[PDB]
Amino acid sequence: GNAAALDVFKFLSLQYQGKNLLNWLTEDSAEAVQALSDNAEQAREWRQAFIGITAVKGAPASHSLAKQLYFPLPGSGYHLLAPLFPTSLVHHVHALLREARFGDAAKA
RNA sequence: CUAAGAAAUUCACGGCGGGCUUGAUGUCCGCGUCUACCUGGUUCACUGCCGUGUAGGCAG
C-alpha cells in the first residue's frame, strides 16, 4: 500500500503486541470497545475495517509488466503461469542468512 | 513459445617530499645402477645425353 497506510499498519502491529488483541481486534466487543472508547456501532465499524484489511480485497488480474510464461502440456496445448515474487520466503531466508553471517554465535 | 518481450553512464583531474638494514657463522658422514638388442622401412626420386623445347624419351 501507500506509505501513509504503512503508518497505520505499524500502529496495528503495535496493537497486536502485549495482549491477545492481535486476534482480538475482531473477536471481541466489550473488551474492544471499552478500551477503544467508541460507540458500539462505531466499534463494529472499526472491527469491520480490521477484518477488511486482513482480507485481500483485490480483483483477480495481472499486469503487462509481469512475466506470464507458457508451460507446455503433455501432448496438448499450453498454460499461462504468472510467477509472483515470494516475499515472506525471502524474508525468512534473509533472516537465516543474516543470522548465519552475524551474531554473537557467528562472531564467537 | 525461454522470471519472455525494452533500454547510451559521463564529463574533468599533479600523489611527492626524505631516509645507512646491520653485525657473526664447519653442511657431513656412507653407497655396485644392471641385463639384451639388425636402422633400415625399396628411404640416394641421382647423374649425363638426343631433342629449339619446359613436349617426349634415352644411358648407368
Automatic annotation (TrEMBL):
<protein>
    <submittedName>
        <fullName>Uncharacterized protein</fullName>
    </submittedName>
</protein>
